[PDB]
Structure formats: C-alpha cells, structure tokens
C-alpha cells in the first residue's frame, strides 16, 4: 500500500464518533485501560462499517481485568486486548455524560496544566470494584452489553507497519516513556529534551503528518480537552522517540 504523507482517522471514518472523543482518566493510573477502550471503540465501529457505534466502558476493563496489572496503580496492554477478545467490554461514557452500562465513576481534572477543571493533584483513587451491573436507567443486562474482539496482536516496531495498520484497521494503542518535560507540553511536536523518567504512559495513535519537514504521530491523550492541542499531541515519528514505535498493540473484531 502507498502511505499518504498525512492521515487522520477522524477524517477517514467520521461516522465513528468515538475517534474524535477525548476522555479523561481522572485521578487514576488507568491510561492503559483508556488507550484500550478508546481504540477498541474506534475499531469496533470502523471494522463493522458503523454498525457497532459505541463508547466502551473504561471502568469495566479497569475494574474487572484480573491479568491487566494494578488497576488505578497502572497496567499492561497485551492482557487488556486479550480481555476484550475473551470476556469483552460493556458500554459506558464519561461521568458527566453518565450514558451506557457502566459510565466512569471519576470526574474530569487538570493533568499538570491550566484550565477550567479542578487540578488532578498527586493522590489517586482506589481502583473501583468489578460490579458487573448496568446503571438503573440502562435496560440491557451487563453480560448482554459485552462487545468482544476476535484477535489481538502486537504491531511490528516499524514506522510503515504501524502506518499501514492504522490506515487499514483503525487507531492503535501505544506505550511510551514519560519524561518530566512531557508534563510541560502545551502544543507542537514533542520530543524528550529535559527531565528524568516518570514511568510509562499508554495513548491512542490516530494518524500522522509532517510540519516544516518534521514527521510526527498524531495522538489522543486521556487528560481531557484542556491538555495539549484540544486533548491531542504530536510526537516525532520514525526514530522510536520515547519508545513510541515499540509498544504498539491492537486487535480486530473479525
Ligand atoms: C498511566 C500513565 C499515568 O497515569 N500518568 C503518567 O504517565 C504521568 C502522570 O501524571 C499525572 C499520570 C499519573 C500516574 C498515576 C499513577 C501512577 C503513576 C502515574 C499509567 C500510570 N501507566 C501505566 O499503566 C503503564 C502503561 C504502559 C506504558 C503500557 N504501565 C506501568 O506504569 C506499569 C504498571 C505495572 C506493571 C502494573 O509499571 C511500570 O511501568 C513501573 C511503575 C510501577 C511499578 C510497580 C507497581 C506500579 C507501577 N515503572 C517503574 C515505570
Ligand atoms: Na490545551
């Protein structure tokens, strides 16, 4: 396949409303579960030609996956996509939308940036319990609201392989190393210049582009719309910046 010089999943599949939705993980290390349910929502819609047009529940995966790690204390991508294949994930919107089977219990907060939400601060919530119960107004039983995948895989640590995966099958989840300067990001094309490691972050890659000859990935963060470029950031593409090309995971419904 010829790879275009830029690609935006939001523009290829505009009927799939999840693709342009920015979420907020709140005071919780649930990034691993947000990048997962976001990319699964997108891919469920894209691969079903818009038939499965849903917002999958971050709290269902976060609270119920026994193999994914430590809930609000952080997690692992492979087992999140295996959970989607094996048990599936119910629907559920943000806390403020309170739509679907299991909406997120935690409110929007600012992640080391200025804006109109309360600051996240340094304390995290306890991981919610696995309740397996749809909100009272939702009239599908929990187990009947499950959306499943067929396959999950790691994507090759190769720029062109990742571009082909995104443009054919949809946004992907990806891990990268967070250095302190990432917390100062306001706009433009991120690269690590200053600061020590703060650990790992999991995000959603939706496309790519080039500006002033600088190639980038276009990424949806889960820190609400006030963070970065209306909730998005760009990061140098092609040099495995912060290991962005080395921890890509996704999956298919068919
Ligand atoms: C999401 C990322 C996140 O919440 N972050 C940041 O990256 C920067 C932040 O500051 C606002 C937030 C807040 C934060 C909240 C709780 C803890 C730490 C920071 C989460 C935390 N990241 C992950 O889940 C990560 C995803 C990968 C890249 C796919 N994985 C991990 O962090 C693993 C989780 C274990 C295996 C369960 O752990 C590590 O990578 C460890 C840290 C660790 C070790 C033992 C128990 C818990 C965490 N490393 C030493 C980096
Ligand atoms: Na901003």
Residue numbers in the entry: 70 to 323
Task: Quote the paper.
The component digestive proteases in Schistosoma mansoni (S. mansoni) include the CA clan cysteine proteases, cathepsin B1, cathepsin C (dipeptidyl aminopeptidase I), and cathepsins L1–L3, the CD clan protease known as legumain (asparaginyl endopeptidase), and the clan AA aspartic protease, cathepsin D.11,13,14S. mansoni cathepsin B1 (SmCB1) is a central digestive protease due to its high abundance and dual mode of action as both an endo- and an exopeptidase (specifically, a carboxydipeptidase). The occluding loop is characteristic of cathepsin B-type proteases and distinguishes them from cathepsin L-type proteases, which are strict endopeptidases. The inhibitors are located in the active site cleft of SmCB1, which contains the catalytic residues Cys100 and His270 (supported by Asn290 and Gln94) and has restricted access to the primed region (beyond S1′ and S2′ subsites) by the occluding loop (Phe175 to Pro197), a hallmark of cathepsins B.15,17 Gallinamides form an irreversible covalent bond to the thiol group of Cys100 through the Cß atom of the vinyl group of the acrylamide warhead.
The structures were determined by molecular replacement and refined using data to resolutions of 1.20 1.60, and 1.55 Å for the complexes of gallinamide A, 1, and 6, respectively. The P1′ position contains the C-terminal MMP group with various R1′ substituents, including side chains of alanine, leucine, and phenylalanine in gallinamide A, 1, and 6, respectively. Two different conformations were modeled for the phenylalanine side chain in the MMP group of compound 6. In one conformation (labeled A in Figure 4), it is flipped out from the S1′ subsite to S1, while in the other (B), it is directed toward the S2′ subsite. The conformation A appears to be intramolecularly stabilized by a CH-π interaction of the P1′-phenylalanine and P1 alanine side chains. A double conformation of Ile193 was observed in the complexes of 1 and gallinamide A, but not in the complex of 6 due to steric hindrance by R1′. However, for 6, we observed a T-shape π–π interaction of the MMP ring in conformation A with Trp292. Not surprisingly, P4 is not involved in significant interactions with SmCB1, except for a hydrophobic interaction of the P4 phenylalanine of 6, which is rotated to approach Leu139 in the S3 subsite.
